[PDB]
Amino acid sequence: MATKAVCVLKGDGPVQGIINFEQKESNGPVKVWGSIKGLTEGLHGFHVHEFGDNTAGCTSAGPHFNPLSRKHGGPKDEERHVGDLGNVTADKDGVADVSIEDSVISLSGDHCIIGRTLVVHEKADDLGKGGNEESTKTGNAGSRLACGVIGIAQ
Amino acid sequence: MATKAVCVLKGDGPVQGIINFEQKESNGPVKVWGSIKGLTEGLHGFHVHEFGDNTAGCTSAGPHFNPLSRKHGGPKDEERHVGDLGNVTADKDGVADVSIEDSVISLSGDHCIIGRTLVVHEKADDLGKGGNEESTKTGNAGSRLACGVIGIAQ
Ligand SMILES: [Zn+2]
Ligand SMILES: [Zn+2]
Numbered sequence A, B: 001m002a003t004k005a006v007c008v009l010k011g012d013g014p015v016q017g018i019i020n021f022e023q024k025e026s027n028g029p030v031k032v033w034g035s036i037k038g039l040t041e042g043l044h045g046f047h048v049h050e051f052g053d054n055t056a057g058c059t060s061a062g063p064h065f066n067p068l069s070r071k072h073g074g075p076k077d078e079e080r081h082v083g084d085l086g087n088v089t090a091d092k093d094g095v096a097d098v099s100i101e102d103s104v105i106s107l108s109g110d111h112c113i114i115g116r117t118l119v120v121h122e123k124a125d126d127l128g129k130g131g132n133e134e135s136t137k138t139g140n141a142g143s144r145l146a147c148g149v150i151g152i153a154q
Helices: B133-137
Strands: A006-009 A016-022 A030-037 A041-047 A055-058 A082-091 A096-102 A118-120 A144-149 B005-007 B016-022 B031-039 B042-049 B055-058 B084-090 B096-102 B118-123 B142-148
Touching: A006 A118, A016 A096, A016 A144, A030 A082, A041 A055, A055 A144, A082 A096, A118 B142, A144 B142, B005 B118, B016 B096, B016 B142, B055 B142, B084 B096
Parallel strands: none
Antiparallel strands: A006 A016, A006 A144, A016 A030, A030 A096, A041 A082, A041 A118, A118 A144, B005 B016, B005 B142, B016 B031, B031 B096, B042 B084, B042 B118, B118 B142
């Protein structure tokens, strides 16, 4: 069973990064860390999308991974998509040194995110609190700057 | 339980392709089809490798996916790696039309190839019948020309 995964995020602009995942036990959290560069300073939505399909770049990854058909939320919310990892923050150099721990995604089982797509977005995810229709779907995080398929790692 | 998967192959050179996987029954075969271009005319090894890790390009994909610790063979041989999908054939325009049906790989359970890497190789795989060590490991198929993580598809 997988205890590590990795994702190489690429896109058509300056955004690119490598993100690691580790889950030492299948009943425990997944640690998510890595570095993405090229980002405008501040918050960027950071989500696992349903499909690991990059045939049309980031668009073919589909919507946020949402096997329980919930509304969009922030990672601390009970009402959230499985793929709702919230925001990552880039510094004044444009670098996001990601450090997230999440207990809803998994590397095995029904919430398994291996073979799905991680996407870093153009804007802040409002964590489902924006009061418009879009907030309940995407958090108003805007376009997909860079993405990659989440793969099993050694 | 995935029934469809896709893989976008890319590498440092011109080899590019999209390969689709479909498995309508969990205990049934997998259909594998699509097209790779930019290849030299002739046969190229076509394998699922163990890690869906592209951090160092196709090198970080590691060895052929081999959960049952067998020897390398062709896809019709009973002694084979789970990831041994034989050769694809490129025509004079450098295009390989891939169409195979395989009963050893799966899109679910312990042989599951989602999150691993499909790699197209520089030379013909000798199907484990070239009589040196290298043949029983890699089939002497040589360099990795392009690869991608195998992702869940709609
Ligand atoms: Zn969401
Ligand atoms: Zn092999």
